[PDB]
Amino acid sequence: ANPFFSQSLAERDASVRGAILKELERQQSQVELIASENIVSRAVLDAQGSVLTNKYADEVEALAIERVKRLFNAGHANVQPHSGAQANGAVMLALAKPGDTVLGMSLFNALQYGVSRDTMLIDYDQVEALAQQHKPSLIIAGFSAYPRKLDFARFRAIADSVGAKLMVDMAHIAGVIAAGRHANPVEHAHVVTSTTHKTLRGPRGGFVLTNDEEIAKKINSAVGPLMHVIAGKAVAFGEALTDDFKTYIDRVLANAQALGDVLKAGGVDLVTGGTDNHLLLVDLRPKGLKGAQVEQALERAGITCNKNGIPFDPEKPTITSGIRLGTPAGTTRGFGAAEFREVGRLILEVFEALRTNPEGDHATEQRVRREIFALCERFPIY
Amino acid sequence: NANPFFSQSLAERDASVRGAILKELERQQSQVELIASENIVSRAVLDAQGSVLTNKYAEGADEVEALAIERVKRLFNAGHANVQPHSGAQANGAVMLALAKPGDTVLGMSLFNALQYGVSRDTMLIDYDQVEALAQQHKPSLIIAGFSAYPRKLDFARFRAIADSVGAKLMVDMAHIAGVIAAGRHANPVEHAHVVTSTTHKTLRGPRGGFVLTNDEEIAKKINSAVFGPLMHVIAGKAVAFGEALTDDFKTYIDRVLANAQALGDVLKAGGVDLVTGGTDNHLLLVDLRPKGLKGAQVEQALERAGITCNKNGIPFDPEKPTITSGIRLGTPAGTTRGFGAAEFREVGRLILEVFEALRTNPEGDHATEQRVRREIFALCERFPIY
């Protein structure tokens, strides 16, 4: 009988309502190709919007833990971190000493390894080379939005060779791993970290996995809490345990191949020449285009992505020679191969306009935007 | 929508999580929450937190943020605001780095070289001359006021004078009393502090989170740099709560919160326990259990079994270990939100006293009494349903 309790946001707050509606329209009417973005289930929304917020100014945590352990075949889990970065931070604070040398990927004395200038593939001989050299206490695999498989066993071998622990940040590929469509790092790393959003299609947040009990205790110590968010994690982990999630990931992967092939046929390059996952790293050089200019034009055209510096990019970082695309969001809304090929066609249309007008072609962008709107309306969300 | 991913509720899809949610609802529905930092958010805030705004900035201004900013500025008559902090501690942390250099002495309340001031052993109140003497001696670069769950007014003007006298900045952490200030029922530290920090929950009845206020644009710039992925749905929740707080209805809420604390405190006092400072100027009650020879932990544990949640709380200069303590801390915000008035809080006080008395013979607990009180608590809450 009390409106504080009875009335909706929509009924009470016109301005916020308006803002939410504009955001809904953004999500409904544009194609989201940002690789880290996704669209959560109504169930995850219900969790985040639950009365669990009114606490700790727990069953759901137990559920999240048991589910994630099952999902990734891990002996131990911590589902408390508020973010992937915070998970990573907790692990380092637990597995490393100040002044330690830590060897990580890039696409505490922080040392970086990357990919080969000539193949765009991970430098394993060179990762080892360099581990051997600098004697890191910790080696970190993953972390980077890399479009090819990671050889965790090889990473672990290298680790072992120099008396280092192996940490894997699977944040960019967690959903792929969960569906069994990528090697599971849990089987090879001393510790695994991840985000709960992105390809796991949950709320923003983190978690940590290990098979080692003593590592688990250190993790727990080194690591809110937002119980409604934890509920959301539980919901998402539960979803990922289902066959429907396996099918989702299957389509994500297939959709990335479809889109990638179209872009290549259309005369751009892909870093590493393709993908093993949901990620496409587009090299715009063959068309003499620039990352920032392309990102901007695509957005005007109703397609969102990220400019992206390619390995050994000849452009300064505010410019770049690439964009990064991912299929998770579009796949969630129901896109299949045909739809992603259409998206490709439209992207290529914008590319071609930019070749004679790098600053943008309004006419082309508008047409594309409208076609994007039409495509999206055939695949409604929420 | 045709797709169950989009069309079906949590209730329909996830029985186990739904069950957990229902259990939590029942906890909130059938117990009296007296934890002073706890509250019960509006359906509107829930809607925001459960909005599609979650599907943004996965890789780490915006309309909802601009709304939050406009609103909190108006609410606290502040020239500048940052609504990004994920917590009160995060807000405090950022301001400390803004305003203070490593190795600096910082002088803050307790009930960097971190130094503390408290209340007078004499008056059990802040002694501003004592605080000033500490400042003069230790020359802090930063003085922090608030922060502590102190049940009396804070003289921010005087804190500023003290700070000036030693060339220190003044920070006020108003987390524990933000709602009271928002309603105009406590002096506003924005008028006196270089910077003010707060949480968005507690007496502001929003989502968990923090914010930072200042009237000084240069400090604002520094704050913004210090504070810098965002939860847009949470920011929306902040916006909603700030909007609610701007209303006359919110002023009435605080009015009731305050009166309710007086009512509850009166009963406890008449019942033969003491209140630290002898009462309260806000929503807080610091109960001193010594007259009944009771301990905080034992009392907290017993009350919880009796369906009344509070925190054990060390009194100033508590002779007991901090895991034990000689007190409990109570607050009226949550109960007030569900509709309790003075009479209802007097009833709660009566029931609390029943538990105290059982414990005077059986400090480890009395099931009979606890379960009886629990039933009476259930019946009370039933008259004031939530959600």
Curated annotation (Swiss-Prot), chain B:
Pfam families: SHMT
Cellular-component GO terms for this entry: cytosol
Residues at the site labelled Plays an important role in substrate specificity: 201
Pathway: One-carbon metabolism; tetrahydrofolate interconversion; Amino-acid biosynthesis; glycine biosynthesis; glycine from L-serine: step 1/1
Broadest EC class assigned to this enzyme: transferase
Location of this chain's protein in the cell: Cytoplasm
Modified residues (N6-(pyridoxal phosphate)lysine): 202
Taxonomy, superkingdom: Bacteria
UniProt subunit comment: Homodimer.
Family: Belongs to the SHMT family.
Protein name listed in UniProt: Serine hydroxymethyltransferase 2
Organism: Burkholderia pseudomallei (strain K96243)
